[PDB]
Design a protein around this ligand. Sequence first.
Ligand SMILES: Nc1ncnc2c1ncn2[C@@H]1O[C@H](COP(=O)(O)OP(=O)(O)OP(=O)(O)O)[C@@H](O)[C@H]1O
Ligand SMILES: Nc1ncnc2c1ncn2[C@@H]1O[C@H](COP(=O)(O)OP(=O)(O)OP(=O)(O)O)[C@@H](O)[C@H]1O
Ligand SMILES: Nc1ncnc2c1ncn2[C@@H]1O[C@H](COP(=O)(O)OP(=O)(O)OP(=O)(O)O)[C@@H](O)[C@H]1O
Ligand SMILES: Nc1ncnc2c1ncn2[C@@H]1O[C@H](COP(=O)(O)OP(=O)(O)OP(=O)(O)O)[C@@H](O)[C@H]1O
Ligand SMILES: Nc1ncnc2c1ncn2[C@@H]1O[C@H](COP(=O)(O)OP(=O)(O)OP(=O)(O)O)[C@@H](O)[C@H]1O
Ligand SMILES: Nc1ncnc2c1ncn2[C@@H]1O[C@H](COP(=O)(O)OP(=O)(O)OP(=O)(O)O)[C@@H](O)[C@H]1O
Ligand SMILES: Nc1ncnc2c1ncn2[C@@H]1O[C@H](COP(=O)(O)OP(=O)(O)OP(=O)(O)O)[C@@H](O)[C@H]1O
Lengths: 216, 219, 219, 216, 221, 221, 220
Amino acid sequence: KPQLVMFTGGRDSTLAACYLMLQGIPVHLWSGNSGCSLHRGILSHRVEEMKNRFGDLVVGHTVADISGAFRSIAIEALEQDILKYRKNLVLLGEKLAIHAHLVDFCRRNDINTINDGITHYQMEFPEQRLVAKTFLMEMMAQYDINYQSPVYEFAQSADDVKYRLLQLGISTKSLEGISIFADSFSTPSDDVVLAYLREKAPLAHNIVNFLAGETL
Amino acid sequence: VKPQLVMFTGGRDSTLAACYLMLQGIPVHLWSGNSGCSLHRGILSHRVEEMKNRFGDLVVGHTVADISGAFRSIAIEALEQDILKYRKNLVLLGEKLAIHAHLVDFCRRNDINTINDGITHYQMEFPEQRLVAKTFLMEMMAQYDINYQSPVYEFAQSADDVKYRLLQLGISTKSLEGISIFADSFSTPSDDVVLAYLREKAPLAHNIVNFLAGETLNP
Amino acid sequence: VKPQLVMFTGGRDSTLAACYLMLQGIPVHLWSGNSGCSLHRGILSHRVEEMKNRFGDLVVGHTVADISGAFRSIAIEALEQDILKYRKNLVLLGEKLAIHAHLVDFCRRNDINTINDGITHYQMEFPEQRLVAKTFLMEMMAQYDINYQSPVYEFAQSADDVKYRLLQLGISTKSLEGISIFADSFSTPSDDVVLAYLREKAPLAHNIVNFLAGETLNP
Amino acid sequence: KPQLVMFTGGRDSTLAACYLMLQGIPVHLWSGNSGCSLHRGILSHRVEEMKNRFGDLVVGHTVADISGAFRSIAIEALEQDILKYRKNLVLLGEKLAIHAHLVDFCRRNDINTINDGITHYQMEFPEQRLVAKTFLMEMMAQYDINYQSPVYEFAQSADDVKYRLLQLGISTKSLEGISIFADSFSTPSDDVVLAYLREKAPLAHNIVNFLAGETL
Amino acid sequence: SVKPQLVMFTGGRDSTLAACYLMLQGIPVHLWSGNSGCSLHRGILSHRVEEMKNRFGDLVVGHTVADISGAFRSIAIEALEQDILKYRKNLVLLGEKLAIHAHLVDFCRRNDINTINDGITHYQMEFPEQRLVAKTFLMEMMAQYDINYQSPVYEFAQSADDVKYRLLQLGISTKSLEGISIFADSFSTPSDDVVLAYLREKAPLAHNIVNFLAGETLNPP
Amino acid sequence: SVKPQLVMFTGGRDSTLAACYLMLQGIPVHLWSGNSGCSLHRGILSHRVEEMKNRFGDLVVGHTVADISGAFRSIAIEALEQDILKYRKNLVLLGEKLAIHAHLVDFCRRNDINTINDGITHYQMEFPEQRLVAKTFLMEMMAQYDINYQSPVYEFAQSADDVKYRLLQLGISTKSLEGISIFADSFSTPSDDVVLAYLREKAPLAHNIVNFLAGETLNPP
Amino acid sequence: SVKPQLVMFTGGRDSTLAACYLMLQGIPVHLWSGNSGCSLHRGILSHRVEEMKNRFGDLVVGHTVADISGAFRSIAIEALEQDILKYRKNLVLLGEKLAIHAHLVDFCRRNDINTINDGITHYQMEFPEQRLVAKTFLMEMMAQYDINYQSPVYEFAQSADDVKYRLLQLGISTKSLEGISIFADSFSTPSDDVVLAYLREKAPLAHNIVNFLAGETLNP
Ligand SMILES: Nc1ncnc2c1ncn2[C@@H]1O[C@H](COP(=O)(O)OP(=O)(O)OP(=O)(O)O)[C@@H](O)[C@H]1O
Ligand SMILES: Nc1ncnc2c1ncn2[C@@H]1O[C@H](COP(=O)(O)OP(=O)(O)OP(=O)(O)O)[C@@H](O)[C@H]1O
Ligand SMILES: Nc1ncnc2c1ncn2[C@@H]1O[C@H](COP(=O)(O)OP(=O)(O)OP(=O)(O)O)[C@@H](O)[C@H]1O
Ligand SMILES: Nc1ncnc2c1ncn2[C@@H]1O[C@H](COP(=O)(O)OP(=O)(O)OP(=O)(O)O)[C@@H](O)[C@H]1O
Ligand SMILES: Nc1ncnc2c1ncn2[C@@H]1O[C@H](COP(=O)(O)OP(=O)(O)OP(=O)(O)O)[C@@H](O)[C@H]1O
Ligand SMILES: Nc1ncnc2c1ncn2[C@@H]1O[C@H](COP(=O)(O)OP(=O)(O)OP(=O)(O)O)[C@@H](O)[C@H]1O
Ligand SMILES: Nc1ncnc2c1ncn2[C@@H]1O[C@H](COP(=O)(O)OP(=O)(O)OP(=O)(O)O)[C@@H](O)[C@H]1O
């Protein structure tokens, strides 16, 4: 019954968690700390709001250190990555790293649905494009994991997410940390997003294998 | 005996409705909707204590529900348009619709199928207390198999009637409620206008019911 | 160095205004007006703690003032009439007038004669942030020998400008404020209409100043 | 500097206290318990509201047992009083009793101004009429005491008092006990109000003398 | 072990002796005290209650202090002008007894009690509440709800000294340790005819209150 | 008793020895640690600090841990795409040092300190931050604000073993007990010319931040 | 579930990763640390241990710190002048490993453990104890007592950066959080032949100590 939600504290992943819980689906909130987030403290205010409105349906909050996988995939070869694609795709790497950790986490805790707060209105960002959602859906499916985005189609604008949150008696603010990498990049082409993901998939599967104790 | 809900503000009329039900041995879940624009509501919980004191276990509980979101959606978000159109400030009618939306969800999630309020004959000047609105919101709740009753409507010919019955229960005669900032911010609308507004906003309210039940995200 | 007041919501613009003053060694009394219709304001005090952490004694204090009464008097009591007349929902302009009334009384009672806000060029779409209203309320406060300054008005060409300066102070970039339920409940009024409204309500506001000073009870 | 306010917790005496404190005049709040008030507990909520908004300007709250003077003046000879005036004027008696106690209290605590919340809009009630205010002003003046009603002229309706209270961030409700004698009477003529006061003045001056240790 | 009965208990010598005499017989008592809203200096009651738990233990099954100010006002105070102009007498303290009896009907029904006892005394028949015309009226009233209203010290107490010395033999104080009504000494002696006409004029309001307290109606008499 | 100086202190062996050598001379030190927002596993720092209070007592006058994430981002991260495309090298950790120096100008001015010291070492000149072209540039920068920037172990530390064994003679651990930048091992060796062009391109932004922190302007560079 | 194995654990990156990789496979580990009496600044070990209990839970079945100063002195120090004059090389740190292995035989027998693991790495070597000739000698020694001696990260560690970054992926610190020996950096590279003659000269002492620890003899 319980499913995982990739939960940052921001409005989009909050609404995704909340909508699932409204349906009677318990959620394990999963927060990945990639090592470069500033002022993350406000997250726990958001978590309290949700335990207050949904009770037992919030089954868990995990904060996971994913700095090592993030660094391996996105930072270690930054000079090469940027010279090649002429774009700073660290935050796309970060999502790959998340997904790698979630494979291990799901296997080790008997979870086979994962959910995030990707939104149609934020397609400007690499990690939130159909080409990357499709790539990662396929990736997770290879390990029998269902990857859903329960607010993707509904969220045509930020105002859409804001007002439903408000109807749940939850705050409209994004109560998350910010990446230091925020606003450190221009928009990449779809083709480049997908070539990057495919360039880093080997590293990511490798890390999955490592975390499972299978290899290297 | 199966608990019923009382829409409870702390004022004398909803207090007496709760109390009369409990005198009959019917347990009550007191339900208070906070629409986000109430001033000085602290005194509510004094009233609740008086009632646990007088009736014990028959007060199964008190829920204070944040309905600011639905209230804003229905009554405030389009306030300019709403007022320019109907030439009357119907926010407090909207707020009742918002309450009703939340009560559908609340009743379904806590297995409650009778709701009661403190509507009174002596206060029919206000839209939420007029037959046309009461009948509308009564049909609305019937559509979800919820019975909406007004146990002190007929009896309360004046405020003094409610006051002195409360006094016979050893409870205070004062209205111990917060006040809407929107109180007395409006002139009297026609019945026809009350009903056109309710009908204009019903879609939004049913939609919110569906959202709260987790059946949709869309409008 | 003589303390000044900052009209402080918790949002990035008023935060940066406070912070810039304190960087200069000017102590600030943070002043927050609660008009009674704000949702989810708890996060304000997180922002205040960040600021005491970063600047210490230069934060002489934080006042959270209930201005629901003046707000209702000026903006809500006659909402039907106000909207039908000007064909625009100017409650949030009223709320600023209410703030200004209270600040006159507060400044006089705490020996403060400079007030500062976080008005920003990038947000002039909203009435309270337009030259015509700022100039009006600036004259208003001058009539009581109070200097009303906007220390980040010129600098803030975009939100990103304010965000990154805050970040350089080790403070969060988020707007950690409650939201008015009246936010985004209105279309854009003409300057002429903004000014006619302010002028229509000035009597009420000066009257309230006089009441708060204990000089009259009458209107 | 400090003056006394006859304070019940209701809107009228609250506003009177508050208006005086806005002027920088400290107030000693004085509450007379005449022995027949129901559900008086809510008074202390009102007192807290005022200490919160005005601080040191609230110099005192005295709750005084005036049941004995009340009984002596208003109740002891109720059968005669009612047969004579064909009106139940207990609550007028009660005010006389208050004033008697206040003479003693003022003398013993160096206070020479007293204030109440009498209002123009409530002239239907005996104790709140010019004929009784004038009678009691004269009575208090005989002991060098100034009796003022700072909200009398301003309060043309209840809405007038309500909205100024609200501008002070105080509640609009009357947070007082009710006399059991509430609504137990019809309206008396001015002539009857004044004849009653004059019939009971001897008893009241006598009680003043008793409280001062001068007599009987 | 016998079925508990209720005693209308003020703390005074008369209701104290009535309670005590019942407990001497092995009848447990639920002490019931009506606060009608106008009582001064009632704190001394609990000293008397302690004396009684000390002397009789578990036979004292309960002390209930009931706020009956609302029914009192309704019956006795609300229409005081009219009541006094009509009967030329101040019968509030008679009203107060009617109010008590109304509450006792509800209380008895809700706590499975069918005998009530008071400390009415022959020597105090000058007071309206303790006259046979009133006692008889209230016995009838309570009987209509299958309640037995007894006055176990009425016949015995020819003078105050009679009650005092029996109390003293139980190691209990002879004093009346009760609050005083503010209405004490506020009334002259009424005729029997007037006592009964008043009770009859107020019976509708009393039955009505009984019905309200039982949750049977909200409409007024 | 001598005027306290500041040491840029990470917990590693080099900045530890620089602090220690100053304190051996009777110079008190204010340890200053910049948290640039991207450091992993920094908890072990405070073990090193305790070793140093243990060994030198009151000469350790302070430890300040400063959040410099904002200036770091502004200088090094905000324009990372452009920066890397231009210099064909990842110079974030050089930016980070500029950011530190900007904050130290403000900190020195606000705490009456006019000597700053670091643990730059000859053996680590492969890193941009520890090259003479950068050291010289920053000495000039700090001198413009009457601040003396010294590197008291630069000349001595020909190898890591040199620093290790001196530490050991003070009864202090030889290990680097610092957090690691996530940017560790994320960069190849840049030319001196490129190091200096970067510092010169970012100097405007650094002086601008100094001015902001001093409360002199809010306008951007 | 799976049968616990022992890891020779110093707190350094290589033995930490060896422990961790075993636990990733679901194999519980008993961490075993030998204190030979001449280690400086070893306090930081217990920080590393806490990181691992945090990351793997019950899979960390114990940490044993054994005082092996007695056996160390017996084998490596007592006859230091003779040993050095003879082999013209300071092989104390080789002796130290022999002493470790002696204690591990006794420990394994007394706690029902039959696999021991270390953090030897292909990239490092250079050091006598990590040389094939000594590794093979000690594998033979422990085989004589039915003990399996494995090196689970020998191949898999490609460089030091490779061990660092795997540790980082587990949310563990990259640092070597171990003490240093005072005998560090105090030796001239010895020949293979000399390493093996020393081991063979000291094996009698080591087997003797095993027997003593088992309570089988007092004599030499
Ligand atoms: N650090 C993280 N840990 C867990 N899940 C994350 C993390 N970062 C992003 N996600 C998931 O991926 C989605 C992509 O969000 P992104 O980082 O683009 O910011 P966003 O769209 O503003 O999301 P949100 O409002 O939920 O923070 C999030 O909605 C969340 O479900
Ligand atoms: N915010 C609310 N929460 C819960 N119930 C409410 C609320 N507002 C109104 N109601 C219900 O609707 C009834 C009618 O309310 P209305 O404001 O029209 O009259 P009222 O005299 O103020 O009621 P009351 O005496 O109960 O305060 C109330 O008695 C109550 O049962
Ligand atoms: N309720 C209030 N209390 C105190 N000051 C206020 C309040 N509302 C507005 N102000 C002042 O007026 C300024 C302009 O407010 P406005 O709502 O127009 O913009 P804003 O972007 O929301 O401001 P902020 O970023 O400070 O929240 C604020 O920055 C603040 O200085
Ligand atoms: N028990 C009392 N103790 C002290 N002052 C009293 C008392 N009762 C009345 N007063 C004073 O006399 C005035 C007459 O008030 P009254 O009893 O007629 O009720 P009211 O007009 O509703 O007043 P309020 O709202 O202040 O209770 C009060 O405003 C107060 O100043
Ligand atoms: N408030 C009350 N609560 C309970 N019982 C009461 C109350 N008032 C009167 N009674 C009962 O009715 C009787 C009436 O007594 P009454 O008031 O005439 O004075 P009393 O005879 O002096 O009282 P007491 O019994 O205390 O000596 C009491 O003896 C008691 O049994
Ligand atoms: N975050 C920081 N806070 C304070 N000082 C710092 C910081 N980063 C570097 N420094 C200073 O600048 C020098 C640069 O050192 P670098 O980053 O090249 O690594 P390192 O030489 O291994 O560091 P360490 O001195 O810790 O051994 C440090 O020795 C220290 O004096
Ligand atoms: N005293 C000891 N106690 C326990 N195990 C030890 C001890 N000395 C060595 N080992 C084990 O045998 C290996 C021998 O390698 P050595 O300690 O000489 O260098 P290293 O590989 O750098 O050490 P580390 O694994 O601690 O980083 C260690 O890695 C560890 O697995």
